[PDB]
Each structure stands twice: as structure tokens, then as C-alpha cells.
Design a protein around this ligand. Structure first.
Ligand SMILES: CC(C)=CCC/C(C)=C/CC/C(C)=C/CSP(=O)(O)OP(=O)(O)O
Ligand SMILES: CC(C)=CCC/C(C)=C/CC/C(C)=C/CSP(=O)(O)OP(=O)(O)O
Ligand SMILES: [Mg+2]
Ligand SMILES: [Mg+2]
Ligand SMILES: [Mg+2]
Length: 283
């Protein structure tokens, strides 16, 4: 039983998601155990690639990670907890390495940050760092991932846009602007507005424009539900509804640009799980 054989490796991954994403841990913990542990392994790989760049600015770390993935792709499993847990997942489900490579390519681009010029640019980037994650997970969630790659990529995009909209102030502080040059021009936002406590009128317009796009993408992605394995629906919809709720938080705090993380209460998460359970009955 490979989940017993590699139980410490899966425990290693579980602890990583538990400590880093209370939201995705709560949402995905509703999966049957082996599928949930498989998600945690994938989370671990993602979290490691991202922390390397965003926290550590360690391009040499990200190179090592790329070399391990190339080996893994060849069939030579790196002797490393995350890679050993991933080998079990790849043994058990029709996982594919392509979106894992896409994630590293997106991370590497963040290592030399440029503001997107267009929404097209921003949309390609959201694929590499977020839509790819949907593709990593699909084989855990549906009998044929190819059937629903489009809506899966949309949910990853909706989430990444939500992350962007949540973190405008902290990002700018760090030297990053994800909002598009074209949007800033269209809505008459000056980058100076990005360091204030509450969004000015122009930035609220832009914020809401992008939030509407995210909200549309969430809704569009929900088209995949009928092809999602029944026992996986509550967990996946939970992840979506919990993440989407952060848009309403920023609105309720009157478009605060800072301190928007960890603002969805446990109470509100529980409410959302029940909403999700009601919502799914309509499939
Ligand atoms: C498998 C699964 C359910 C989830 C994997 C999610 C992860 C960790 C993906 C790595 C890259 C991303 C999208 C990081 C968060 S956006 P950010 O880097 O701007 O924000 P942050 O400050 O790191 O939260
Ligand atoms: C499953 C599927 C078909 C589509 C969804 C794909 C997923 C899960 C994309 C992850 C995107 C993001 C922004 C994750 C935040 S990771 P975090 O741990 O840093 O939490 P935080 O950034 O702090 O919100
Ligand atoms: Mg990042
Ligand atoms: Mg990060
Ligand atoms: Mg971010």
C-alpha cells in the first residue's frame, strides 16, 4: 500500500499545506483521503517553487527544482519527500508533467518581474502560475482531464486574479504591479494611488472591472461540475467559493489595498461549505 509505504512523505506534504493555506487545506480535506493527500503533494511542489522566487529570490534553487522535474519526467524519481509522494500520485492517476514545467516557467518569469502591458499578457501569465495548477490536479478530479481543460484553466485564472486584487498594496511595496498598463490608462489610475490605504475612485473602477472578469471566470469554470467525479465536487467547489469570497472582503473594507489576507473567518468558511453543498444539489 504505497500510502503506507510513503506515509511520512505524504505527512510532510500535508503539514506544508496545513501551515501555508488554511483555506485550501480545509477545502481539499473534504476529498477522500488518498485524493486529498495527492493534492497536498501537488500543493507542496507548487509552494516550494513559489517560495523559492517570491520569498528567497533564489534562482539557483529554482534551477535545481527544474533539474529534479526533468529527471522525474524521464522516470528517474528524485530521492526527496515531495518527489517521492508525487511519484505515487503519478503511479496512481494519469498525471502529466507538462503543467509542472509550466509552473516553473511562470515562476522564473516572476524572478525578473515586468508589469503586464495588456490583459492578454496578464491572462497568459495567470495560466503559467495558476491555470497550470488546475491542470496538475485535473487527473485527480475527473475521469478524463482533456474534457474540461478549458474551464479548469479558467478557475485557476479567476483565483490568480483574486489574489492580485487582494494584494495590490503589498505587491506594489515589493516592486510589483500586476494590474495592466492598459487598464491603468483606461481608468486613469496613477501608480501613486497604489500606495494608499483605500482605493481612489479611479482605482475602484479598475478594481471592479477586473473583479467582474474574475467573477465571470469563476462562474464559467463551474461548467465543469457535471464531469467532476461526484466525491470530488464538494471539495473543489469549496476551494472556489472560499477563494472568491476574498473579493467581497476587499469590498466590505471599502477597497482597502493592504491587510486583506486571512480575513475570511472560520465561521464564514463553514457557511460557505454549507452554501456549496446546497449549490451542488442543482447539479
Ligand atoms: C495544489 C493547490 C491546491 C494549490 C497550489 C497553489 C500554489 C502554492 C501555487 C504556487 C504559485 C501561486 C499561484 C502562488 C500564490 S499567488 P502569490 O505568490 O502572489 O501569493 P502568496 O503571497 O504566495 O500567497
Ligand atoms: C483545481 C482546479 C481545476 C483549479 C484551481 C487551481 C488552483 C488551486 C490554483 C491556485 C491559484 C492560487 C492563487 C492559489 C493561492 S495559493 P496560497 O497557499 O498562497 O493561499 P494564498 O495565496 O495566501 O491565498
Ligand atoms: Mg508567486
Ligand atoms: Mg508567493
Ligand atoms: Mg500575489
Amino acid at each position: 500500500d504505497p500510502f503506507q509505504e510513503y506515509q511520512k512523505d505524504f505527512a510532510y506534504c500535508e503539514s506544508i499545506i496545513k501551515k501555508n493555506s488554511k483555506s485550501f487545506y480545509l477545502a481539499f480535506s473534504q476529498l477522500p483521503k488518498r485524493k486529498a493527500q495527492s493534492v497536498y503533494a501537488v500543493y507542496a511542489f507548487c509552494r516550494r517553487a513559489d517560495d523559492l522566487i517570491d520569498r528567497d529570490n533564489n534562482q539557483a534553487g529554482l534551477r535545481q527544482l527544474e533539474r529534479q522535474l526533468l529527471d522525474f519526467n524521464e522516470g528517474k524519481v528524485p530521492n526527496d519527500p515531495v518527489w517521492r509522494a508525487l511519484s505515487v500520485v503519478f503511479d496512481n492517476f494519469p498525471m502529466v508533467t507538462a503543467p509542472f514545467f509550466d509552473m516553473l516557467t511562470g515562476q522564473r518569469k516572476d524572478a525578473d518581474f515586468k508589469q503586464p502591458e495588456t490583459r492578454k499578457d496578464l491572462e497568459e501569465y495567470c495560466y503559467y502560475v495558476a491555470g497550470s495548477v488546475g491542470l496538475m490536479l485535473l487527473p485527480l478530479l475527473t475521469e478524463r482531464p482533456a474534457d474540461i481543460v478549458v474551464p479548469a484553466k479558467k478557475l485557476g485564472e479567476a483565483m490568480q486574479l483574486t489574489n492580485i486584487l487582494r494584494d495590490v498594496g503589498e505587491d506594489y511595496q515589493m516592486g510589483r504591479i500586476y494590474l495592466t498598463k492598459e487598464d491603468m490608462t483606461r481608468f486613469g489610475v496613477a501608480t501613486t494611488m497604489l500606495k494608499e490605504k483605500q482605493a481612489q475612485t479611479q482605482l475602484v473602477a479598475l478594481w471592479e472591472s477586473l473583479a467582474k472578469q474574475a467573477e465571470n471566470l469563476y462562474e464559467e469554470s463551474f461548467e465543469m461540475f457535471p464531469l467532476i467525479t461526484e466525491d470530488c465536487r464538494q471539495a473543489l467547489a469549496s476551494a472556489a467559493f472560499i477563494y472568491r469570497e476574498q473579493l467581497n472582503i476587499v469590498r466590505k473594507q471599502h477597497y482597502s489595498l493592504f491587510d486583506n489576507k486571512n480575513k475570511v473567518s472560520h465561521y464564514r468558511k463553514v457557511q460557505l461549505l454549507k452554501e456549496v453543498k446546497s449549490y451542488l444539489k442543482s447539479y
